[PDB]
Nucleic acid binder design. Sequence first.
DNA 1: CCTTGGCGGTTAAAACGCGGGGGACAGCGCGTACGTGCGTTTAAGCGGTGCTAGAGCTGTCTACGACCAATTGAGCGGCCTCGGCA
DNA 2: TGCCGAGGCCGCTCAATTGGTCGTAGACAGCTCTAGCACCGCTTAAACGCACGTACGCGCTGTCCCCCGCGTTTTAACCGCCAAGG
Lengths: 49, 90, 74, 89, 76, 64, 88
Amino acid sequence: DAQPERKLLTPGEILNVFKHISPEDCFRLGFNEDYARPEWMIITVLPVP
Amino acid sequence: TVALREIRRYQKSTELLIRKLPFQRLVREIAQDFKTDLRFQSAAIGALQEASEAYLVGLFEDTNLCAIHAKRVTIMPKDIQLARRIRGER
Amino acid sequence: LLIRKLPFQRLVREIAQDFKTDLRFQSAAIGALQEASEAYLVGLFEDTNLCAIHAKRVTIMPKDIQLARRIRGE
Amino acid sequence: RTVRAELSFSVSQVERSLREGHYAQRLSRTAPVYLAAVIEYLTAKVLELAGNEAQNSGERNITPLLLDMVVHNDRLLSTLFNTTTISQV
Amino acid sequence: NIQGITKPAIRRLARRGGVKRISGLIYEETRGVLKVFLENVIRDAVTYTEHAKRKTVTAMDVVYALKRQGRTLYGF
Amino acid sequence: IKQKLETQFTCLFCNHDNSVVCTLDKKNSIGLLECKKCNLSFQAPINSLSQPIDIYSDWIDACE
Amino acid sequence: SYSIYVYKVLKQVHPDTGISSKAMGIMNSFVNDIFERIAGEASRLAHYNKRSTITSREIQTAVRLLLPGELAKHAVSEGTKAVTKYTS
DNA sequence: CCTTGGCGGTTAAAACGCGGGGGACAGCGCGTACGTGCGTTTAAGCGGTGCTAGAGCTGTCTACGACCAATTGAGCGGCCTCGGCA
DNA sequence: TGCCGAGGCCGCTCAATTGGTCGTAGACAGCTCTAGCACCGCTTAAACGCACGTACGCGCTGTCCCCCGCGTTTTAACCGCCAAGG
Ligand SMILES: [Zn+2]
């Protein structure tokens, strides 16, 4: 047994990790390179209706 | 004969002869008796096991020589009680 | 000291000549060598004795000395 | 100075280690060249035998089993490794 | 416990050492020699860890503890 | 089976909060408080009804 | 640290034979050990004579002290025939 | 409909009793070469001046290499171009 | 036929060079210490033979505890099931 250090996984931290996912692994995860790219689930600019 | 066979084999190889898990438990137990919940790098325990097995093997060489000196083929307590004394361990 | 000191000095100067030439020795240097040598030999004889007794031999033999020296890593 | 002395170890990096080890207050002009030359000799004597034993046995690379078999054999340098233990892990 | 150093692991080690036939009163002795060796090396490894203000005994603390017994260990 | 639980209690010595771990061994009726920081350890008896607040209460009275 | 030069000497002594990745760490711990032993011993030498500069002479003596016999002879001949080739 | 509290099911091997069968521990017999206390005589060992000087101890003097401070050149990693094997 | 493997160019970070202090390292002198090497008188310590004894070693015996194989079986350690809650 060892002392674990759980730190918060901020959106910005996760955002950079997602852009480095390869196209071949993007497909295998059921996402889609043209229409549903996985880093687009994080919001950086909000559309104003 | 099978004894000789094993000696030809083990002396040929270099894998650790004590089970990993058990050794990890012994080390952590003993260490726990000096300082509570001490965390260990895996390499630390590995270092301890390499050192311990090299030590025991050498000890068994000397022990063997002590047994053979007394015209015996079987290692006993009087062998180690002698090897370790001459080593300055006791 | 149990060895004639002078003999330890002779032997010493002889051995030393084989390493470096025209050497001189302080008397205390030779004395140091003799204390060390005799202490070493005495301890060795203790261990040898233990080997002999181990082999139903309380009386040291060359075999005993050789075992002792092998286990010492000498 | 390493190619100029026709050596293979850097007199520089080792000298930097000496500065960082703080083994003295001031080094000499030619002390690290001697220490790198001497060290270089020990590496080119151990690896010369590891490369002799890899081709004597028939091995291609050099494994730690080759180092453990050589340095405890070869009474030339087995005295340097009386009290060493190659981990093999 | 020390009982994890089993009978056939001490026998295997003896086989590596060159022992032919081994008497029964040697495993306990080995268990008692191995425990002394670990109590001498782990004390120094824990001393280097408490000196380094750590809580994890790394492998270089074990290499330093074996170096303080004339048992230098290469590969860590 | 033992229960290893983290708590939101403050260690009475090092004062780090949310760093006290409680190990309750009901098979032998022995509860164990541990810090994760200074790692001070405290043992106390537990029943079958006890919870991390029961031994942490016994630790407050064992100091005072 | 010293692993980049072990392979560079190995290319001279055996340009055909390669080396593993654990054996490089073993040769690197061997080099950092015989370095911190020769420099340590040399440091002891510079203190016993109350000097302040480690010259090549304290390295030649620490090589004579540490290495036994023919390894010290060869060790002192390679350092001497490297310092002389250096000064020229 | 989904994920933890404690519980069977999941292996490499040893917890080896215990059936078999023999290497070899310690006491006992004989049995021989070597082996030290005491004995002789000795050649070196312990303690004293006499003589003679090498270099350590301690003092102040003169001195050359490192510390930390501004310059600035080569090795290495990230772009970026060139090129023959598939 | 053409793009990823390798060498070249542009930045990064640490190494190399130069100039002023600066106390410590090297020189050097005065001078007393214990090591210098040569001879006496006496003595504790050493070279060589003895011999009946205790220890050192070889051979045969008992019975006896580790020797080798098999089988599940159990801790320790990796993979799936009971039926309560939110
Ligand atoms: Zn605390």
